[PDB]
Every structure is written in C-alpha cells, then in structure tokens.
Design a protein around this nucleic acid. Sequence first.
RNA 1: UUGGCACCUCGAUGUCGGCUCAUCGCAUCCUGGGGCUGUAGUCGGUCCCAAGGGUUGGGCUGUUCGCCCAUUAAAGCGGUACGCGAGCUGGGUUCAGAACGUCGUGAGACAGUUCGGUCCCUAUCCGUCGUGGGCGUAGGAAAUUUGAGAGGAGCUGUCCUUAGUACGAGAGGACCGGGAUGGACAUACCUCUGGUGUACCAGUUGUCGUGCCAACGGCAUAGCUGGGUAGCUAUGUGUGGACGGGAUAAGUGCUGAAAGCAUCUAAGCAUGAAGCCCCCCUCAAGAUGAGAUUUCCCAACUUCGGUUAUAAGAUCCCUCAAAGAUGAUGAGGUUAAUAGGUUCGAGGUGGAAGCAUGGUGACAUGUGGAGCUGACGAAUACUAAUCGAUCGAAGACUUAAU
Lengths: 215, 122, 109, 47, 119
Amino acid sequence: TKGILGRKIGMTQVFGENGELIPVTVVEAKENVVLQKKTVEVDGYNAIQVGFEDKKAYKKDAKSNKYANKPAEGHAKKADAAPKRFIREFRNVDVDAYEVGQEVSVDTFVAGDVIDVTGVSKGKGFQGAIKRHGQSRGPMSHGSHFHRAPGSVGMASDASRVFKGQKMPGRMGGNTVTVQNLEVVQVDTENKVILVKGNVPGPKKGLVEIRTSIK
Amino acid sequence: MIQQETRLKVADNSGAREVLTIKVLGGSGRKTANIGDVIVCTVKNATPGGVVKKGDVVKAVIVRTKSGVRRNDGSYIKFDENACVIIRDDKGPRGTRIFGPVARELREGNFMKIVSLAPEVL
Amino acid sequence: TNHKLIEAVTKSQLRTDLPSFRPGDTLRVHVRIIEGTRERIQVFEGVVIKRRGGGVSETFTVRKISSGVGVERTFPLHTPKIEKIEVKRRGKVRRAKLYYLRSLRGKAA
Amino acid sequence: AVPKRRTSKTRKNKRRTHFKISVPGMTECPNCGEYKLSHRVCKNCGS
Amino acid sequence: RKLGRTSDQRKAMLRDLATSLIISERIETTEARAKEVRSVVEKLITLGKKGDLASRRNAAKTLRNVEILNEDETTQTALQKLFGEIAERYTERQGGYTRILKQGPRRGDGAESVIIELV
RNA sequence: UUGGCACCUCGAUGUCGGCUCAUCGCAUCCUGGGGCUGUAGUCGGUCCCAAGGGUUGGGCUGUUCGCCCAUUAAAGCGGUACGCGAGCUGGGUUCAGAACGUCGUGAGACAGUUCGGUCCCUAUCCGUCGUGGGCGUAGGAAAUUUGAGAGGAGCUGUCCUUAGUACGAGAGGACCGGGAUGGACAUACCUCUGGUGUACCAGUUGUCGUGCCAACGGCAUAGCUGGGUAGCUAUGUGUGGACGGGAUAAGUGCUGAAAGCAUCUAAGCAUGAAGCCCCCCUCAAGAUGAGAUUUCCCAACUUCGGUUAUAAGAUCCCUCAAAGAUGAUGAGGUUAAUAGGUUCGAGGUGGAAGCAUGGUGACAUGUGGAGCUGACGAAUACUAAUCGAUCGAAGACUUAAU
Ligand SMILES: [Mg+2]
Ligand SMILES: [Mg+2]
Ligand SMILES: [Mg+2]
Ligand SMILES: [Mg+2]
Ligand SMILES: [Mg+2]
Ligand SMILES: [Mg+2]
Ligand SMILES: [Mg+2]
Ligand SMILES: [Mg+2]
Ligand SMILES: [Mg+2]
Ligand SMILES: [Mg+2]
Ligand SMILES: [Mg+2]
C-alpha cells in the first residue's frame, strides 16, 4: 500500500521512549509522480507503476543516461511530468484510487505502520568457498595442506556425476532480498524523508522500494 | 563471553576459590554465556575449611563477566574479572557474605536472595 | 558536517546544556532508573576514559573502582536518562584516550 | 592432468574464434596528413 | 589510491619523481605514475602560495635535499626554485593545476606514455 | 556383519580410521496424528499412518566398537567402491634399522608386543558454480512486466494465565484455548560494542645524512609501542520460520441394502495430520509453444538486384565507481559538476614551528583545543573527459471479419 520508492543515505540512532535506543536507517524519498496504470480490462493485472527522481530534457546527443529519449518522452508525456529514472510496478494495492499524474505523498504512513523493504544487495565481487556459504575451513596446522578450499563434491562411481546445486566458489553477487516486518519510527514531511527500524539492503545512494507488510 | 573451560575467581564465602566450567547449561548445543545464566562447574582450588571440597561438581550462577552487557537503553557494564556464585539449587547461595559488586540484570531471573545479600549493585 | 539532511531529522532530538569537558576529568553522573515501586535516582562517580564520535551518536565512558573491581560503564551522552553531570576535578593528561588503566594506582594528576 | 584425446581440426579452429584484435579509434588530425590515435598527441602531426 | 610496487618505494620513489618534475618542467612516464603524481606535486605547491617558514619545513618533508641547478650559471638549490620562480608564476585559484597529454604505447611494453606539463 | 564361489581388474582399479562436504532409504530417536491398555491425573508400555525438519560438547585408545562425565525436545539404524587422498593429514596396517618373549642346532621366522620411518601431477572432454559475444523472436528500439516451470524456507524449549481447580482420601496434578521471552540455524547491515586499518596523527631507540645548534629525512618486520577515519566484517545491531485455504493416509462418523437385524460402504455425505498443492521470498518467455502493455522512426535508385545511406536507438573512445578477474553493471563527456585540484566542514589525533617568559640545566608555561590530515559531505570550472568514426529499419503468402 502506497509503494514509495526512496533511496538511502545512511544510518543513525534515535532515542525513542523511556530509555529505548533504536537504530534507524534514513530513507530519502523524493518526488514520485504516478505514470500510467494497467488493469484487467487492458491485458490482465491490476497495477500502478510509479516513477522516481527525474532528469533533464530530451534528445540532443545522449552521451549519458541523465538525458531522456523519444521512448521515455512520450511515455512520460502521458502524465505530463518530467521524464524518469526508476519505474517500478506495484501490483499490491488500489486499482480504484490513485488518479494518473498525481504526486503520491510522503505521509501515507503513520509512525507505527509496519512495512517491508525490497532492495538489491551489496555485491562483494567474486568470492570463494567459506565466505560465500557457511562452510568451515580446514585445520591451519598439524601439517594439513587443506586450509580454505571446498572439500569433496560427490561420491565414487556409483554416482559418476556432481549433483547440481552444489554451492561452489562463484560470484557473491548483488541480487534482490526482502526483509519483512520492519516498522517506521518517525515520518518527516517538510524535508521529505522517512525513517525505518533496523537496516535495509543496498548501499548508499542506492534504490529501495518499500510497501505495506503482509503479516 | 564465558564458555567451555573458563576459570573463574568465585566470589562466595564457601570454600571454593577457583572453579572451571564444564557446560553452559541451557539449550541444545549451547556455547556462550553472560550474566544471569547458570553453569555447571567443578572446583579446583579450595580454601581450607569452608563448605565444599575439591572435586565436587556443583551448579553455579554467573555474575560479572568480563565483556559487557547491553541493557536496553544504550548502556554497557564492563567489569574487570570473571566471577561466580555457587547456588543451592534453589536459586540462593550457600554462604552469606558474597563480595564483588554485582550486575542488576540477574533480577528478572528471580535471583533476589543474592542481590539483598550483596554490596553495591549496578 | 555529516550531510545536509541527517541532522535535519536529528538536531531536534540532540540534547542541550551538557557541560563539555575532556578525558581526564572526574565525573559524578546521576541517572534515573526504575525498579518496582521506585523511580529512584543514583549517583555514579568515576573517571572518563574516552570520548568518541560526535553527533547524535556520540559516546563517552567512565571507570570507577568499586570494591577492588574496576567497574566501567558507558553511556550515549545525549540520552534522556542521564540527569546531571558535575565536574569534580580537571585533569592533566597527555594521551587523548586512556586505555592504559589496567594498573592499581594510576592517580591522574 | 593430461589430455585423454588429441583435439581434432574442428575444436582447434572452433576454440580460437574469440581470439582476434580490433582496430583502434583512428581519428585523423586536421593538418598532419597522418592519423593520430584518439585522445592522443603524436610527434609530427597537427596534433 | 593507486600503487606501483611496495610501501617503502612508493613514497621514496614518488617523492623523487616530483623533484625531477621541478628541475625540468615536463617529463614523460607511464599512466599510473602520472595519474598519481598529478596529485602530489600540485598539493605541494600550495606551499608556494603561502611561502612562510612553517611552510618551508613541510616542503622539506617531500622534496629531495638535492638537485642543485645551473640555469643562471649559479646554484639554486631546488627548494629555493619553487618559492621564487613557481609561486611567483602562479596566482590562479586552484593552486598550480598541471595538465597531462597522452601519447602512444612503447616498443617493448604496452604502457601509454604521457607528457605531463607544469601549466 | 562372518563366510562360500573365482565371473571382470596384476601392461597397478591406492588400503583402515579421522577432518572438509554432502546426498538417499524408513525397519522412526525427538516433534505431528490416532487405536489399545492390568491407562485415577502427571508419567509409562505396545501398535498403526507419517521423511517436512532436527539429531550434542569432552576423557580414554590409531581406532571402528565400547564404557564413563555433564547436558538436551532427542543423542535412530543403514546405503552411497565398509561414500569422498588427480580435496587433506599418516596415528596403524603392508618396506629396509633395533630389541623382548618364544620356535628353529642355523640363516631367520610371529592376525605377539615395542621405538623410528619420502604420500607425485600446470585440467583436454563430460558434470558443476558463476559470467559474456553471434543469431533467432516476419519492420527497428527503449522501458516496465505476466509466470508455464525451477530453486529457497519448513526445527524447537522454558516461564506465566485458565487453577491449584477435574480425577485421586493424600502424594501430586492437566487435556483444550491465550501471554511472555530463550536456544540452534538461514539471511540483511555497520549507528552503537570490538577487531583490522602499510601515503593519517603523536612518543622514543640506535646509526647515517641535509656545512653546525635547533628542526627533518633514509634504514632497521611498517624499527617499536598508545590510538584512529573510510572500506570489509562478528563475537555487534535488526529481521526471519507464518496466519489462512483444497484432497487425503491412519483413525473416528452419519445415513444403507446385499444377507428383512446389525453393519463406516457397495452407489452417496462428513470430519481428520510439522505430510502433498495454492499461499511466503528468489530466479525465470532460448517456455523456438520465443508471451503482454505503453512510447519513438518511416526514402531514392528502381525489372526490389535493392543498390544504398541514414533515423530512432546504440557503440567505438575517454575521467571513475554504489560495480568489478577481463568483459559485463552504473554514474559522466563542455548546454558538463565525472574524477583530480582549491575552499569550507565532520571525524581523528592532542596543544606544531618560531618567538617570549622561568629554570645553570633536563625542560616547564603562554601566544592557541592549536597545528596536521587517506578513502566520507558541500561549494567552485582551475586541469583533463576535444575534433571524429562504426553498426543500425523501410515490413512475404493463405483464407477468415470488414
Ligand atoms: Mg560378500
Ligand atoms: Mg570354472
Ligand atoms: Mg598382458
Ligand atoms: Mg593399463
Ligand atoms: Mg600406488
Ligand atoms: Mg511406516
Ligand atoms: Mg532427513
Ligand atoms: Mg588432559
Ligand atoms: Mg635356541
Ligand atoms: Mg652529523
Ligand atoms: Mg554551477
């Protein structure tokens, strides 16, 4: 419900009530003007897609991607707002309301509405065995030349294969992950940020979509 | 933390002076400990006299471990000595005159005969 | 400064009128607690060992011997649970942090 | 740690097919009569 | 922060490369020195724009105690050079910001040589 | 398991235990569901259906096995070349030395002990874990996506309320529903707690050098100790395991003849489990059965031989990084804040040098929370991202609705 699309900037602590300290991730949630929505009448899933931070004008000589293009020009002219950089589905909520071309708000929530968080990982390059998966290393002394490699992979020749799904050294990777049931300690309106509880994925100046919980 | 085979200058007036922990009893595969748990332990040193004698497996609460404890406001209590109190298996000590200032955290776990029998409690 | 907008959320909770000092001083920190039928309030003498990491996340800690044991306690100094800080005595130290107190007669003067 | 088979004259040529070299930028100077490499300065060019 | 080989060299080689920059005013070398020596000799000649005795001592933290000169048939000791003929030249706002210009590779290697120029 | 047979291997198929890593049966150890008890309750015996998940730390010996200590909800039985040495140790067994008992007149012998004994290899192809180029997807491109499928996760204790009530004289003491926080495990992240922090800051030791004193370099593991920002992490901080559905297995049932009564069943109708599917999260249209919505671009030679030469949109090439083995992913390329510099600030260190005062000095004190700063934040075009090139569409037939 009301999937805002903020980005992080860091993490600090905020003293709650009587003595309680709770660590807080501060999520900068800039402008979010709703682009076209799609329903069951058109082709079959009721959803609201949302934009995020804008960029400059269109079609001069696009060296970068902070300039738009004739695809995203007419796709964003339809709602008569500036062209965008991050467009995300929300098939969670509310096919009825949310008129097209509406800024959403920042205060859809209250200080106590539980949320979820979807964001990409850090990604730590190509890393090996006992750092990626929870495997334990070998003995570092008494003569053993088996310090840190993964062990055996399969049996002898009554299974002449190695079974796929084997947890071998590959890339650590940034793939998506969703924590569940975080809460909001405080909402700001004027500086246009919110806060959450604990810590969410996705390193600084990243991207994170948040939405209501499913408890 | 205090784990499998630590050695603890016990604080009671009941004859033991140093004990060593066999197991940190709790859940299955329990490894670590901190203030308020209960460990089973066998004495090594023994004061002449006292109550208990050398080589007698007794159960004993933990008090004031070396690393801190995080109470829920943001404080920390780091002591400077691992210590212990031998319990009677009714959550009360053996002797009377336990030394060595005690952390407040062992109160929800109904150890309140130790706290009233003690010097300065934080 | 940290950013343009960390403190814009956070300056409205930062605490005023805590008399600024340096590691080497001798403090008498009061603090309000609760236990049962009490909101009783307790003093705690000691010497500042270190002071760290300014902003809303700033931290100091104090050290006091109690009965032969060195009790070391740490606070986040902007908490609304500390009541009153005195400064009993100024200090003459050279190092900023003071981890070398594992001795038995330090006597910082 | 040895081969078990001599690789034939198909998986020799099929393997080395991603082993090439491409031309570089090659933008010409205005008055050199000589092609500099892009974002560089020659010794005897209009660069 | 880039590197060359190792921690003892990477100071005492790299400080002995800005010295040859001072007495010659243009040199050619490979990339990861010249991308990196850009931000040491330029940070050094902010001390030209101050030029007091407390800045004179810290200029002796980096440059050699060495490389006498002879351009006026007389000896400028290469610490007296930059405070009279370099700091006087530059009064633009960003210190003594120097340019680089890249060239082709070399024969026996594939490093891109680059003339830096103290302008 | 102990064997029997000699079928493959002697132009070598490495052999016991243990560490590393699993994967599979159920004849089930715990947890879930029942029948039956010579089951008062709490406990317990025995049997049926059930593999979804769990299955401990130490002493002893090479050990397997075994006994013993302290726990736990439990410390299951097995297969996988008695799983795993082109992944590892070598303690024993099966190498030369030596000795003891013993048998042999002798050389020597022993499933009898006993001390010491070299463990080789750079990955061709399949199989894996990641990760890119070409082409297909009847015009080209961008963005967002549906989800056939496939992976992931599934564990539990203790305390309190019902209540000291039902049963039971008394000892003790709930089923069934609600409330708390723990354990182990799987994740995400550095604000706090700590660790590291090799171009940061301060003290000091030898010796050499900058003509000398003061200052400061070089070398000695980074010469050594105290501390420390970013980045990376746990022993640190949060979060997690679902609630809810549909058919059943064991079992319990209602109606009901065969076989006038009974009878759960033969035709119908129920209910019934951590089990199966949908639900939770992750991947996924190369799912050639190649899906879906929105948006942008449309011409002359010319017997479409399309010769071309371009748009949309990319890219070559450069300054780096929230990304990173290269390639790939992002952020930018003068209409510019992408790096470096300059300025200010946070954080760190702890009061610079000179000069003055006091001390015969060693050094104290002011000038002054100073000086000095690598990764983080903001401002500014001062230097460098120039001028250019390369690739890239002009939409077949069939019948049908019009
Ligand atoms: Mg057999
Ligand atoms: Mg025969
Ligand atoms: Mg033969
Ligand atoms: Mg052979
Ligand atoms: Mg062999
Ligand atoms: Mg069965
Ligand atoms: Mg199993
Ligand atoms: Mg022993
Ligand atoms: Mg004889
Ligand atoms: Mg000398
Ligand atoms: Mg500007």
